Design an enzyme around this catalytic site. Sequence first.
Site, mmCIF file in Angstrom:
data_model
loop_
_atom_site.group_PDB
_atom_site.id
_atom_site.type_symbol
_atom_site.label_atom_id
_atom_site.label_comp_id
_atom_site.label_asym_id
_atom_site.label_seq_id
_atom_site.Cartn_x
_atom_site.Cartn_y
_atom_site.Cartn_z
ATOM 1 N N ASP A 112 49.311 39.187 45.495
ATOM 2 C CA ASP A 112 48.115 39.598 46.263
ATOM 3 C C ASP A 112 47.333 38.329 46.675
ATOM 4 O OD1 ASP A 112 44.944 40.674 46.055
ATOM 5 O OD2 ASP A 112 46.234 42.387 46.680
ATOM 6 N N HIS A 274 51.830 48.565 44.341
ATOM 7 C CA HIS A 274 51.422 47.163 44.580
ATOM 8 C C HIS A 274 51.526 46.227 43.365
ATOM 9 C CE1 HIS A 274 49.301 43.926 46.601
ATOM 10 N NE2 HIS A 274 48.220 44.040 45.860
#
Lengths: 295, 304
Positions: A112, A274
């Site tokens: 991320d 994610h």
Amino acid sequence: GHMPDLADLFPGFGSEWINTSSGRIFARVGGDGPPLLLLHGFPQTHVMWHRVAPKLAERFKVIVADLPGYGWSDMPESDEQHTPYTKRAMAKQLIEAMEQLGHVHFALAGHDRGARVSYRLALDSPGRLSKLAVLDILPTYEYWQRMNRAYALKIYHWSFLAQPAPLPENLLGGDPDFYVKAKLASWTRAGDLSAFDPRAVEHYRIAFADPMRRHVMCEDYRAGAYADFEHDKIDVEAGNKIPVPMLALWGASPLDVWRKWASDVQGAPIESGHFLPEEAPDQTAEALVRFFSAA
Amino acid sequence: GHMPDLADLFPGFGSEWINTSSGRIFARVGGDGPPLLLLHGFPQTHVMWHRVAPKLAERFKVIVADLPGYGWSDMPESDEQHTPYTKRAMAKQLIEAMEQLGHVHFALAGHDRGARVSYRLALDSPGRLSKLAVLDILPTYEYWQRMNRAYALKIYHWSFLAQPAPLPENLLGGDPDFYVKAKLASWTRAGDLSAFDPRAVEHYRIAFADPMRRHVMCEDYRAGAYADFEHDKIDVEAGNKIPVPMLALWGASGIAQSAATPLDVWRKWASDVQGAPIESGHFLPEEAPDQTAEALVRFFSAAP
Ligand code: NI
Ligand code: NI
């Protein structure tokens, strides 16, 4: 008493407060052998790697750092261009930190926002890296270029968090615990917090509970909308590619895009939403161990 | 003793709570002449017309309504598709309200979300309208189709407020008075609250202070992201245009012009449209009340 005594999720790892020109970086350090820096993203801290770091520490000296301004790292004063929270600046700051620990060259894995620091480090300073891994991202330019109704709805936080202060800060202050937990749940395969260790969630919550830490997050997203995009756009316009050996992992719940940005890239899908290292720690750790051991 | 102290900004106008099959619609009703329904948008209430309504009431029976769920109107129970907050449904409801007042045909002007109700009404039920004005908008389909990085940043609230409940509601609860005054100021030319009557601002503030009213606004935006967009797409794919004679007004510094030159967009959606910019940000009837009132009177009135 200046710091909360939060759960230790890295048995046997040391702690380091590492000096840099822009302030201290906090990291957990474990294992032995070639250095491997691991960089978390939003809205998390270094503890997101607690499931995979012990495995990597079999073969590497694993350095698990809080991003500038995140977690327990110091928060440099920002400016109108959000300079310290640009990925360019963060990468330079983490380079300084690694040098302190004795490592001019190292391997690097980011998730991320940390992955964004990582690919930018690789564009700016490719000689610093032996190998790079990026988890569940495309470049910032690519997300903005593909902006449309679908993307605007899915990554709304890219535009909300980038609004001028104090708009997002004022709003996040009215139930931060809810926001942080909703943000985590929303991007998991399960749509809840079941993939996370509750002790990790507590780290994430305690960080998000501080207004100064939330301000840094918003500065990061402001950089993401403006300077980081511009930095990326300059590379696209010159056709600049990362020459470092690279691994892109992504949650099946991207290599073609990465081949435009990198000349030596491998990739794999991971059965995960994610948060790869927490939702699929074994598959993620195996992929990283294999890649970083080839050298 | 529950009603807050709020100013009467429409001297002489009556107050009606109008029944419909989905809830009551609140309206101020004044003047003499053929009917003109005026519809506000977000984050406002009917009081936004207070500077233009007297002038229009010289020639028209002016009906100044709170949208379904907004201001003093009742809040219909929503559903997974946000049905009652879809423009299609708000239009049907306001049509019922006009029929209750004795008006089966009428003239219509809308601003912001009320303008989206208005053009949807014109698409769905064109025989209801004699003339239509839309203020500082393009069609919802057009804003989504133009949602690139710059416009995502400019109209971020289109994606924020459309997040699943209760995320925006919980955020807005954090400092609602700051949010509403921020939105009001940011979309003006001056970037402050100087264009607004402070008595009107207090109406906006009081409405926005109620969590139930904020929830309705989020439902509106959710409709705007999903069903309203899909209804517009159907019309675009079919080549369906508004047949009603139409006026598009927009702020030279407003929201609609940030996406595209507005007249050429509206000519794609409408077969008899005129338009003009007003020196203003988004809030045309408050920033530029004399220019806006004149444009509207000249468009709706048969007299020069
Ligand atoms: Ni202490
Ligand atoms: Ni009362």
